[PDB]
Design a protein around this nucleic acid. Structure first.
Ligand SMILES: [Mg+2]
Ligand SMILES: [Mg+2]
Ligand SMILES: [Mg+2]
Ligand SMILES: [Mg+2]
Length: 263
RNA sequence: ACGUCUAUUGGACCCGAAACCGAUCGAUCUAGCGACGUGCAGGUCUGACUUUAAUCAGGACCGAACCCGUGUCUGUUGCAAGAGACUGGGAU
C-alpha cells in the first residue's frame, strides 16, 4: 500500500533494496537551515557523562548536533495571533516542528519553534488561552478541551510546559472530569490524573509516516549517532554472564495519580 | 658466671617464585569519543532536477594516491623482536 509522502527507493543495489524514506514534498517547506538565533551548535556527547565514562551505550558519531529552542509552554505567547511561516524537520525529534511568527503591537516581530499538529499548512494562525478556539494547534486548559478529542503536549505541574504525548503521531484522550483530577488516557493505554490548570495543545502530532520509514542499511542509522550493539551471549563471563521484573521505584509520590498502568 | 652444643622468637645458613594489598605514572603505541581542518587521478553503469545552462544521489562497478593484509615463496641471531616480491580486499 503506497503511502503518499514516502520516497520508495528502487532496489538498485543491496542497502537501497529495502529502504523507505520520508518525502520532503509532503513537507514542502522543510528547506532551509535552522534559524540563526532560534538554534545553536552544541558539541556531541558520545554517551559520556561529566566523569567522561560511558553511561548510555551504543551512541556516538554522525552529523553535527544542532539544538533548537522549542517552546513547550506557549506561556508568553498567550492571546497573540501567531501565523505559521513554515514547517521544519529536526533530526533530534521524531515529530517535526512548526516555525511561528508573532507580531505584537509594541514590539518588533519574532519567531518561535513549537511542535506541529496535523492541521498546520504554513498559513494557519495559532491562538493560546482560556478563550481559544477548538481548531488544532491551539493551547487550551484541560477544563476548556472536550471529552474524547485527541490532545498532545500535556503538562503535569502547571507552568512547566508540555511533557506528555509529544512524539511523532501520538495523542492523549481525556475520558473523565474529576474537579481537580481529570482522568486522561496517556498513549501507553495508561490512565493518569492531570490537574485542570495544566494545558493541552489540541490536535494530533504529525509525522505519522515515522512508523513506515525504513533505514535500509547500517550506515544510514549509524550516521544518526547510533553505534552498533553487541549481543550478551557473544562474550566471556567477566564482560557479561551469557557465554520478568518490574523496575519502577515502589513507594513513589506519583502512585496517587494513576488508575491503571501501561496496557 | 664464662666456654661449647642444641632449642624458641625474630629475615635467622644462603639464593629462587608464581603471588596478595595500597597509591604513583601512563590514551606520543593502541580502543572508543569529542572539536577544528584536509584528501579521495582516471573512467563505467543506474535514478532524479534543470536545460541556450560549469547539478545532485548509490554503505554502486573497474581502477592509481591512500587504508588493509588473502594465498604462495624468500627470510628465521632476518633487511625487519613480524619484513620483502608477486598475487590480492576496500577506495564518496
Ligand atoms: Mg651460658
Ligand atoms: Mg593520563
Ligand atoms: Mg590493489
Ligand atoms: Mg575484484
Amino acid at each position: 500500500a503506497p503511502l503518499p509522502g514516502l520516497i520508495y527507493w528502487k532496489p538498485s543495489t543491496p542497502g537501497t533494496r529495502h529502504k523507505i524514506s520520508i518525502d520532503y514534498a509532503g513537507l514542502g517547506v522543510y528547506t532551509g537551515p535552522p534559524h540563526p538565533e532560534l538554534s545553536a551548535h552544541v558539541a556531541k556527547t558520545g554517551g559520556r557523562n561529566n566523569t567522561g565514562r560511558i553511561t548510555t551505550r551504543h551512541r556516538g558519531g554522525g552529523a553535527p548536533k544542532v539544538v533548537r529552542d522549542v517552546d513547550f509552554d506557549r506561556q508568553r505567547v498567550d492571546g497573540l495571533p501567531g501565523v505559521v511561516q513554515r514547517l521544519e524537520a529536526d533530526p533530534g525529534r521524531s515529530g517535526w516542528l512548526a516555525l511561528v511568527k508573532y507580531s505584537p503591537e509594541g514590539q518588533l516581530p519574532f519567531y518561535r519553534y513549537h511542535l506541529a499538529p496535523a492541521d498546520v499548512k504554513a498559513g494557519d494562525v495559532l491562538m493560546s488561552g482560556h478563550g481559544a478556539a477548538i481548531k488544532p494547534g491551539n493551547v487550551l486548559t484541560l477544563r476548556d478541551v472536550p471529552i474524547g478529542v485527541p490532545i498532545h503536549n500535556i503538562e503535569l505541574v502547571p507552568g512547566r510546559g508540555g511533557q506528555l504525548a509529544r512524539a511523532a503521531s501520538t495523542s492523549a484522550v481525556v475520558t473523565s472530569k474529576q474537579d481537580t483530577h481529570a482522568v486522561v488516557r496517556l498513549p501507553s493505554s495508561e490512565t493518569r490524573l492531570i490537574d485542570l490548570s495544566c494545558r493541552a495543545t489540541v490536535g494530533q502530532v504529525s509525522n505519522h509516516l515515522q512508523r513506515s520509514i525504513n533505514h535500509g542499511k547500517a550506515g544510514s542509522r549509524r550516521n544518526l549517532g547510533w553505534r552498533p550493539s553487541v549481543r550478551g551471549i557473544a562474550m566471556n563471563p567477566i564482560d557479561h554472564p551469557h557465554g520478568g521484573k518490574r523496575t519502577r521505584r515502589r513507594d513513589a509520590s506519583s502512585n496517587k495519580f494513576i488508575i491503571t498502568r501501561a496496557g
